[PDB]
Structure formats: structure tokens, C-alpha cells
Design an enzyme around this catalytic site. Structure first.
Site, PDB file in Angstrom:
ATOM      1  N   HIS A 134     -15.873   1.472  -3.554  1.00 57.48           N
ATOM      2  CA  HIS A 134     -14.454   1.370  -3.244  1.00 57.48           C
ATOM      3  C   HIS A 134     -14.050   0.043  -2.597  1.00 57.48           C
ATOM      4  O   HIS A 134     -12.915  -0.395  -2.761  1.00 57.48           O
ATOM      5  CB  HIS A 134     -14.054   2.528  -2.357  1.00 57.48           C
ATOM      6  CG  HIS A 134     -12.588   2.772  -2.323  1.00 57.48           C
ATOM      7  ND1 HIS A 134     -11.857   3.037  -3.463  1.00 57.48           N
ATOM      8  CD2 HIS A 134     -11.713   2.806  -1.287  1.00 57.48           C
ATOM      9  CE1 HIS A 134     -10.588   3.219  -3.123  1.00 57.48           C
ATOM     10  NE2 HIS A 134     -10.477   3.100  -1.811  1.00 57.48           N
ATOM     11  N   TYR A 171       0.862  -1.195   0.000  1.00 60.79           N
ATOM     12  CA  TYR A 171       0.000   0.000   0.000  1.00 60.79           C
ATOM     13  C   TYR A 171       0.901   1.248   0.000  1.00 60.79           C
ATOM     14  O   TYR A 171       1.149   1.847  -1.053  1.00 60.79           O
ATOM     15  CB  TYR A 171      -0.986  -0.056   1.180  1.00 60.79           C
ATOM     16  CG  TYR A 171      -1.972   1.085   1.244  1.00 60.79           C
ATOM     17  CD1 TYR A 171      -3.095   1.092   0.444  1.00 60.79           C
ATOM     18  CD2 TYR A 171      -1.785   2.148   2.115  1.00 60.79           C
ATOM     19  CE1 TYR A 171      -4.005   2.140   0.507  1.00 60.79           C
ATOM     20  CE2 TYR A 171      -2.678   3.189   2.188  1.00 60.79           C
ATOM     21  CZ  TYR A 171      -3.789   3.192   1.381  1.00 60.79           C
ATOM     22  OH  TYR A 171      -4.644   4.264   1.477  1.00 60.79           O
ATOM     23  N   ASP A 184     -17.772   3.650  -7.027  1.00 60.23           N
ATOM     24  CA  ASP A 184     -16.583   4.009  -6.241  1.00 60.23           C
ATOM     25  C   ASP A 184     -16.465   5.513  -6.223  1.00 60.23           C
ATOM     26  O   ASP A 184     -15.783   6.124  -7.054  1.00 60.23           O
ATOM     27  CB  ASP A 184     -15.285   3.393  -6.732  1.00 60.23           C
ATOM     28  CG  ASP A 184     -14.132   3.677  -5.770  1.00 60.23           C
ATOM     29  OD1 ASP A 184     -14.316   4.533  -4.852  1.00 60.23           O
ATOM     30  OD2 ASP A 184     -13.070   3.027  -5.895  1.00 60.23           O
ATOM     31  N   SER A 239      -6.279   1.096  -4.250  1.00 56.16           N
ATOM     32  CA  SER A 239      -6.460   2.497  -3.859  1.00 56.16           C
ATOM     33  C   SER A 239      -5.115   3.247  -3.984  1.00 56.16           C
ATOM     34  O   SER A 239      -4.546   3.305  -5.082  1.00 56.16           O
ATOM     35  CB  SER A 239      -7.126   2.569  -2.474  1.00 56.16           C
ATOM     36  OG  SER A 239      -7.522   3.882  -2.182  1.00 56.16           O
TER      37      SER A 239
HETATM   38  O1  552 Z   1      -9.683   6.705   1.076  1.00 53.52           O
HETATM   39  C1  552 Z   1      -8.613   7.253   1.093  1.00 53.52           C
HETATM   40  C2  552 Z   1      -8.021   7.853   2.333  1.00 53.52           C
HETATM   41  C3  552 Z   1      -7.203   6.840   3.136  1.00 53.52           C
HETATM   42  C4  552 Z   1      -8.064   6.413   4.321  1.00 53.52           C
HETATM   43  C5  552 Z   1      -9.205   7.361   4.288  1.00 53.52           C
HETATM   44  C6  552 Z   1     -10.197   7.535   5.158  1.00 53.52           C
HETATM   45 CL1  552 Z   1     -10.332   6.559   6.592  1.00 53.52          CL
HETATM   46  N1  552 Z   1     -11.190   8.453   4.993  1.00 53.52           N
HETATM   47  C7  552 Z   1     -11.157   9.178   3.926  1.00 53.52           C
HETATM   48  O2  552 Z   1     -12.028  10.161   3.552  1.00 53.52           O
HETATM   49  C8  552 Z   1     -12.869  10.616   4.601  1.00 53.52           C
HETATM   50  C9  552 Z   1     -12.242  11.652   5.446  1.00 53.52           C
HETATM   51  C10 552 Z   1     -12.636  11.746   6.755  1.00 53.52           C
HETATM   52  C11 552 Z   1     -12.087  12.707   7.566  1.00 53.52           C
HETATM   53  C12 552 Z   1     -11.139  13.557   7.068  1.00 53.52           C
HETATM   54  F1  552 Z   1     -10.582  14.511   7.833  1.00 53.52           F
HETATM   55  C13 552 Z   1     -10.743  13.469   5.756  1.00 53.52           C
HETATM   56  C14 552 Z   1     -11.301  12.512   4.944  1.00 53.52           C
HETATM   57  C15 552 Z   1     -10.078   9.071   2.890  1.00 53.52           C
HETATM   58  O3  552 Z   1     -10.106   9.795   1.920  1.00 53.52           O
HETATM   59  N2  552 Z   1      -9.142   8.133   3.187  1.00 53.52           N
HETATM   60  N3  552 Z   1      -7.820   7.357  -0.009  1.00 53.52           N
HETATM   61  C16 552 Z   1      -6.445   7.765  -0.010  1.00 53.52           C
HETATM   62  C17 552 Z   1      -5.915   7.289  -1.336  1.00 53.52           C
HETATM   63  C18 552 Z   1      -7.143   7.188  -2.224  1.00 53.52           C
HETATM   64  C19 552 Z   1      -8.270   6.863  -1.269  1.00 53.52           C
END
Ligand code: 552
Length: 707
Positions: free
Chosen positions: A677, A470, A638, A551
Site C-alpha cells: 500500500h 484525499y 497491497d 487510497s
Molecule cells: O487504510 C485505510 C484506512 C484509513 C487509515 C487506516 C488505518 Cl490507520 N488503519 C487501517 O486498518 C487497520 C485498523 C486498525 C484499527 C481499527 F479499528 C480498524 C482498522 C485502515 O483500514 N485505515 N483505508 C481507508 C480507505 C482505503 C484504505
């Protein structure tokens, strides 16, 4: 090849200027998921991929074996709410696990919430829930087709009675009941034009914190916090254990930092009636502060403030200056504090990561002293229960070679006795060996890697290998039981590997920072060096090596394919971020700039353009090198990583590389329906997905099934 690649129009007029640097984006039109052109593209692509996979005779053998071996009982930890116990359970092959309730640990359980009856294909899933403090009321989120969007619904626990209350426009939400039982905090986004079902690409901004009074319409909900001048801020609420304070954690992105504000609810003039009287205790984004418990005004937090491996501090709200904070549990030199919970009033349960394996121990709340180590085999803790008022803990352990096991410990006893509570595949662990090694990366940094294979194999390079990574977002890739991966070992003669590359959380914030921003290329170098290690040491050979990630891991394997196509035979990129110049434009992509940077910055553009998969597809110079076989997997809901990333990448691969006479390895995409996703994906779809993955490997590498 057995097929022909689809016609895909190139808009050669499409150019974006990035600080004087011109980038052509001939497949920009695939950014519109609703056009006839994009729909036609997806259908044509699926029409070549599906017969390619289904023609492989290994697919049916793999699918049958997966269906057999994945069919074992799966329980979660029990947890107590009010006078009742709850737990999730899947009998084996149910699409969604079911929430059960009982009146005691010895009592007869009954179904409390069965998501399977909310659809016909298991594509409605639970996404978040919260019990009222007294355990008598229950809020739960539902997501359809794998979208991050949530609808919150409510039940009275006694009789499992559906209530009228429904909350819409919920995404990335807290759920926190006030201890008076009157209502619950949650987050929502403002109404937007177009769709909000997971098929749209619209950016999510101006998230607000609301309070819903039980027994009222959502239209009457109270706005409690909003950030009109900071559209990216997201404020999540939780109540202190004593119910007196609302703690607001404000986040700006995916960075492990947050502002921490509080509201003493006793100081509200007339209950929760509008914007709360927030006290801005920590009003910057310099550190993470995660609430553990409080005793009056003394609040215990997990933090990374000056502590990249994390530590536990006490902040007294009556004397809040940082020089006055007490360090309850200091930072360790190498072991990372993953999480900490308060249980039985004055105990703390601490979970550490020690060389990518979890440990668990009990400490005293008053002094922070270690009291008891809970013995574990090598693996991960993946579930836990035990709140301040509870007098027992449950925890779930998993490992590469044995399924999840649930332990229980009655913390009221003089002699603490952690005991097996639930243990369950009809797989002999003794036939396999697991090792952890550390290999040097390009810059000399030692990187951990787990390797699992059949005992007694010869390291003669002859074995197919599956290497996973990852590398980002402070996520640690720790051991977990995967039936699908073990079938590759047993029935395809494979070797498994996980490389704990930088960007993850395995060695705390310094490990994370080693794989972000200007240093993102370290992730790719680390992962390429993992492949080189497996080859040099005789586990596999390049033509027999498959890499996989999802991802941010999809970005990983896609970049590696571009940079070192010679190193790999097969690449499977799931739900990957492929357009690094545009990712921030869509849904929640703005949040990822804390790991990647953003192309709006001249400085960051120069990092991003060097590894962006969409922008680095290039025929290998050498006549004897072609691209590896590649399979991109995504889905039409997604909304975490919008599927345009994969659509544009595969169009580019097929045109630039697929048209070359020397390219004989296939470059394919599959776009699933009623899926997103990955969170909440039904069992049936998981089985199809892994069957697709291992059929792709089998066909491309001509791997025999071993009965
Ligand atoms: O999904 C994600 C990231 C990694 C874990 C995560 C989480 Cl837990 N929540 C996400 O979004 C919700 C969120 C919640 C609170 C916050 F402060 C910011 C974003 C999020 O974007 N992400 N990506 C990173 C690479 C592509 C996809």
C-alpha cells in the site's frame, strides 16, 4: 496510440443482485490474484505501460533530478529510553532509515537496527516497535514487500543482542510491555487457509489480544481478550504511565470512537494468566477516549465526546459517571486538538490544527492552563518525543518549501528555550510563493486550498497544475516537504495545489461527517470545485490539469474522472478503492464501512452505486469530450486495498472508453512487485514511482523539461 490494449475476457454471465438491483461484473475473475488468467492480465498490462513511460525523455531527467535532490540527510527526533538515546537517520539514499543508539546526547552513536541488511532491495521494513519500561529490551515488527502482516522480533538493548522470541500472525497490532519487564501485549489473527503474505484477499476477523512472556514460545502466550460474538472488534492494550493499569481500547472500524476497558493488574489473582478482570468503564462506541496520563485513579483522556474539535477530560475511576468528569482543557470553537502528551511529570504538550497548520503549546497538568507557546512557521508537526518521565521534548517540523527541522526544549529550566537541534536541500524557498485560499463548494461551504508556485507567474491559464486530495477517514492533509512536487514546479513549470475537502479532519468531526455515508458525494463536489477555482482564477486550464490521490484519494480522483472528465487532462490514482460494492469483502475492508457504508444495506447501496468508480465508467455524451489520460498505480502485496480494485477498473476503462474512436488519451495500469500500500516502501521504489508519475504527466500533456 503507440500500443494496443490487451485482450481481456468478459464474463457476461456474472451478475450480483443487490436488493433487487442487478449489477453485472464481467471482470469478477480478476478478484483471484493466483489464477493464470489474472497473472496474464497483469503481465500484458505492464508490458504496455512500461514502454509508454520509459519512452518519455522527461523520465530520465526527472529521475536524475529526484535522485540528486532527495539525497539529503533525514533525521528523526531523538528519544530517550532508559539511560540511552535513540534516533532514526537516513544518510540520504538508503532504502530504509536506520535506528541509532547513544549513551548521551554528546555521545558517539552506533547502529542499533539496520533494516537494509534484511533484504537486497530494501523491501523489509520496520513496522511498529516498543521498548520495555526500563529501556533494556526492545520489540520490533518487520513487514516484507509492503504487506500489513508483521513478524515481531526482540533484542536485548545492551549489545544489540538478538533474542529467540518471534511472534507470527501479527497485524494491526499494539505492542505494550508490562512495567515488570516480564512480557508484552500484542494482537494476532487466527490461522487461515491459503496465504498470509500480502498477496491474498482473505478478510481479517477475530483479532485477539495476547500476552507474550519474554523467553518463551508463542504457543504459550496468554489470551487476554477476545470477542467471539463480534468478529470485527479489535482490542489494543497500553499500560498506564505508573504501570498499574492495562487500558483496552476496543475499535469496531475506522470511526474515531472506542470502548475503554481497564484492568488493575494488582487485582489479578495470579498475574497475567488468562482473560483479565476487565472493568468496562466506557462500554459503547459513542466517543473516542485516548489515554494521556493518570495520577492515581484520575485518568486524563483526549476525547471527542460532545466535542467535535476534541477536548481533554479527567475521569476518576472511583467516581466514573459522565456527569462527574472534569473538563481539563475545553474544546475550541474552530481549532482541532490533534494530540496531547504528558511530559516532565506535570506538563502537557498540545498540538492543534489552526486552518490546516499545526500549533504547539505547553499546558499545566493540574489546571490545564496555557504556560508557553512554541513558535512555528506555517507547516506541520510530524514527530515528537517526551514521555511523563522525560524532562525534555523534541519535535519535528516540516513545510512545503523547507525540509524537516528538529527542535529541542529542556523543560527543567525556568526560562523555556525551544532551540534548533538538527537542521539540514542544495532549492531556494525565496523563488516560490505559498498561499492559502478558501473557495465555495457546490453547497456554499468554504473549502481551504493551499497553492504553491513560482513567484511572479501570470495567471493566464497556461501552466500545468497538480491538484492533490484525499477526503476521508478524519485524515488532515497538512503541509509537508516534497522534493518530487517541487521538481514539477521548477523543472516542469507547474503549479501545486492541495484541496482540504470534506471527509478529512481539518475542521474536526463535523468536517469528517460532511464527507461520509450519504454525504460522500460532497468530497467529489468539493474537489471538482477546487479544479474549477484553479481554472477560473487562471492558474491552469482543464487540458493542463492533473489530479492525484492515493487510497481513499484514489477513489476521489477516479470518481471525479467519471463525473467530470472535461475538467481534467490527466488522472493518477494510486492504490485506489474502485469497487465500492465489494470493498468490504477483502482483508481489512470491513473497517471502512464507517466512512462509506456497506452494499449489504439497501440504503447504503443506493449511495454507493452512484459514485462507485467501477460502476460509473461511461462514454462522455458530448463529441468534444473524452476521458482524461489515466494511470492507476498498485502493487502485488497491497493487502490494505487489494489490487483487484485497480485491475477491474482498468479492464472496464479500456473496454468501455478505450475502444471508442474519440478516445485518444491512454488508460494504463502499473502493478509493482515486492511492494504494497505504501508504508515502508524503499527509497529506490519511491524514486521510480514519482519518475513514472511525472513522466506520465509529461508525455500526456507534452510538457517540456526546463533545465
Ligand atoms: O487504510 C485505510 C484506512 C484509513 C487509515 C487506516 C488505518 Cl490507520 N488503519 C487501517 O486498518 C487497520 C485498523 C486498525 C484499527 C481499527 F479499528 C480498524 C482498522 C485502515 O483500514 N485505515 N483505508 C481507508 C480507505 C482505503 C484504505
Amino acid at each position: 496510440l503507440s500500443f494496443q490494449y490487451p485482450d481481456v475476457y468478459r464474463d457476461e454471465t456474472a451478475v450480483q443482485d443487490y436488493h433487487g438491483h442487478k449489477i453485472c461484473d464481467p471482470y469478477a475473475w480478476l478478484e483471484d490474484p493466483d489464477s493464470e488468467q489474472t497473472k496474464a492480465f497483469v503481465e500484458a498490462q505492464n508490458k504496455i505501460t512500461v514502454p509508454f513511460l520509459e519512452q518519455c525523455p522527461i523520465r530520465g531527467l526527472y529521475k536524475e533530478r529526484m535522485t540528486e535532490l532527495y539525497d539529503y540527510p533525514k533525521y528523526s527526533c531523538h528519544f530517550k529510553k532508559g539511560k540511552r538515546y535513540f534516533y532514526f537517520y537516513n544518510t540520504g539514499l538508503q532504502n530504509q532509515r536506520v535506528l541509532y543508539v547513544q549513551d548521551s546526547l554528546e555521545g558517539e552513536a552506533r547502529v542499533f537496527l539496520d533494516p537494509n541488511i534484511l533484504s537486497d532491495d530494501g523491501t523489509v521494513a520496520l513496522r511498529g516497535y516498543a521498548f520495555s519500561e526500563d529501556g533494556e529490551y526492545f520489540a520490533y515488527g518487520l513487514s516484507a514487500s509492503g504487506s500489513d502482516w508483521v513478524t515481531i522480533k526482540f533484542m536485548k538493548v545492551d549489545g544489540a543482542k538478538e533474542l529467540p522470541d518471534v511472534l507470527e500472525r501479527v497485524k494491526f497490532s499494539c505492542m505494550a510491555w508490562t512495567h515488570d519487564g516480564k512480557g508484552m501485549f500484542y494482537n494476532s489473527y487466527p490461522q487461515q487457509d491459503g496465504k498470509s503474505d500480502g498477496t491474498e484477499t482473505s478478510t481479517n476477523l477475530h483479532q485477539k489480544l495476547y500476552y507474550h512472556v519474554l523467553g518463551t514460545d508463542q504457543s504459550e502466550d496468554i489470551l487476554c481478550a477476545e470477542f467471539p460474538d463480534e468478529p470485527k472488534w479489535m482490542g489494543g492494550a497500553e499500560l498506564s504511565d505508573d504501570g498499574r493499569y492495562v487500558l483496552l481500547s476496543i475499535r469496531e472500524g475506522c470511526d474515531p470512537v472506542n470502548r475503554l476497558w481497564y484492568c488493575d493488574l494488582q487485582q489479578e489473582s495470579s498475574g497475567i494468566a488468562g482473560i483479565l478482570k476487565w472493568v468496562k468503564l466506557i462500554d459503547n462506541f459513542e466517543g473516542e477516549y485516548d489515554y494521556v496520563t493518570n495520577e492515581g485513579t484520575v485518568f486524563t483522556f483526549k476525547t471527542n465526546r460532545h466535542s467535535p474539535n476534541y477536548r481533554v477530560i479527567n475521569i476518576d475511576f472511583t467516581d466514573p459517571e459522565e456527569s462527574k468528569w472534569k473538563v481539563l482543557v475545553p474544546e475550541h470553537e474552530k481549532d482541532v486538538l490533534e494530540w496531547i502528551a504528558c511530559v516532565r511529570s506535570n506538563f502537557l504538550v498540545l498540538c492543534y490544527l489552526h486552518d490546516v497548520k499545526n500549533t504547539l503549546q505547553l499546558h499545566d497538568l493540574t489546571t490545564g492552563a496555557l504556560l508557553k507557546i512554541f513558535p512555528l512557521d506555517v507547516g506541520s508537526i510530524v514527530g515528537y518525543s517526551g514521555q511523563k518521565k522525560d524532562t525534555e521534548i523534541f519535535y519535528q517540523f516540516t513545510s512545503f518549501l523547507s525540509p524537516g527541522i528538529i527542535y529541542h526544549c529542556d523543560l527543567t529550566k525556568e526560562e523555556l528555550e525551544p532551540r534548533v537541534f538538527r537542521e539540514v536541500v542544495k532549492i531556494d524557498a525565496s523563488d516560490y510563493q505559498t498561499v492559502q485560499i478558501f473557495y465555495p463548494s457546490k453547497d456554499g461551504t468554504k473549502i481551504p486550498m493551499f497553492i504553491v508556485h513560482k513567484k511572479g507567474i501570470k495567471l493566464d491559464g497556461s501552466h500545468p497544475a497538480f491538484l492533490y486530495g484525499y477526503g476521508g477517514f478524519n485524515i488532515s492533509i497538512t503541509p509537508n516537504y516534497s522534493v518530487s512536487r517541487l521538481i514539477f514546479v521548477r523543472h516542469m513549470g507547474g503549479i501545486l495545489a492541495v484541496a482540504n475537502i470534506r471527509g478529512g479532519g481539518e475542521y474536526g468531526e463535523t468536517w469528517h461527517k460532511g464527507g461520509i455515508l450519504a454525504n460522500k458525494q460532497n468530497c467529489f463536489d468539493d474537489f471538482q470545485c477546487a479544479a474549477e477555482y484553479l481554472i477560473k482564477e487562471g492558474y491552469t486550464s482543464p487540458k493542463r490539469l492533473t489530479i492525484n490521490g492515493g487510497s481513499n484519494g484514489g477513489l476521489l480522483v477516479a470518481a471525479c474522472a467519471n463525473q467530470r472528465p472535461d475538467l481534467f487532462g490527466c488522472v493518477i490514482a494510486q492504490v485506489g478503492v474502485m469497487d465500492m460494492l465489494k470493498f468490504h469483502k477483502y482483508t481489512i475492508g470491513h473497517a471502512w464501512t464507517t466512512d462509506y457504508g456497506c452494499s449489504d444495506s439497501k440504503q447504503h447501496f443506493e449511495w454507493l452505486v452512484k459514485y462507485s468508480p467501477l460502476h460509473n465508467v461511461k462514454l462522455p455524451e458530448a463529441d468534444d469530450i473524452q476521458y482524461p489520460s489515466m494511470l492507476l498505480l498498485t502493487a502485488d502485496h497491497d493487502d490494505r486495498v487489494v489490487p483487484l480494485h485497480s485491475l477491474k477498473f482498468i479492464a472496464t476503462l479500456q473496454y468501455i472508453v478505450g475502444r471508442s474512436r474519440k478516445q485518444n488519451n491512454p488508460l494504463l495500469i502499473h502493478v509493482d512487485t515486492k511492494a504494497g500500500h505504501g508504508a515502508g516502501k524503499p527509497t529506490a521504489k519511491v524514486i521510480e514511482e514519482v519518475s513514472d508519475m511525472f513522466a506520465f504527466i509529461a508525455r500526456c500533456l507534452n510538457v517540456d523539461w526546463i533545465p
